[PDB]
Amino acid sequence: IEVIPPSGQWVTDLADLLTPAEERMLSRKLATYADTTSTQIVIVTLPTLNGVPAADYAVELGRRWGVGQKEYDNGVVILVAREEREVFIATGYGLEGAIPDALAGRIVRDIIVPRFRRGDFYGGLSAAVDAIIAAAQGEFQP
């Protein structure tokens, strides 16, 4: 599997879902969380996965980019595959148990997808970040 190379960005919006101001606001939140906790959460948006499963892509991007390694200790990839209408939340092994499949799925189904169907990409991703941070803190309360 070949994924995109490391961007150096908290938000890599290759589907161009977000305005620059929306990217900068998400990026500030993500960077601040990483600074305080050493947990690196990144957002990647892609026009298409070209037939690669979202799970496989998210895991390879976390590996290739070293998400949650190097300067950081734990990692999350939020991968948005626009053509396939998939959102895959991938956590590093360190965070095993913090976001089970049902909690990730409920973030996608109930938090992200209804916002995305209205064109509210910033709100859906912002709320997903907040839910991920709450879950990583042991404080997610659906």
Site for Mg ion in 58-77 (CB under 5 A): none
Residue 13 binds Mg ion, judged by CB under 5 A? yes
* Residue 15 near residue 2, CB atoms below 8 Å: no
Residue closer to Mg ion by CB (options 16, 56) is 16
Residue 110 binds Mg ion, judged by CB under 5 A? no
CA angle 99, 25, 36 (to 5 degrees): 55
Residue 35 binds Mg ion, judged by CB under 5 A? no
Residue 80 binds Mg ion, judged by CB under 5 A? no
Residue closer to Mg ion by CB (options 129, 135) is 129
What is the identity of the amino acid at 112? Answer: I
CA dist 114 and 30 (Å) reads 22
Residue 16 binds Mg ion, judged by CB under 5 A? yes
Instruction: Say how many CA atoms lie within 13 Å of 53 toward its Cβ.
Output: 4
Residues making contact with Mg ion (CB under 5 A): 13, 16, 18
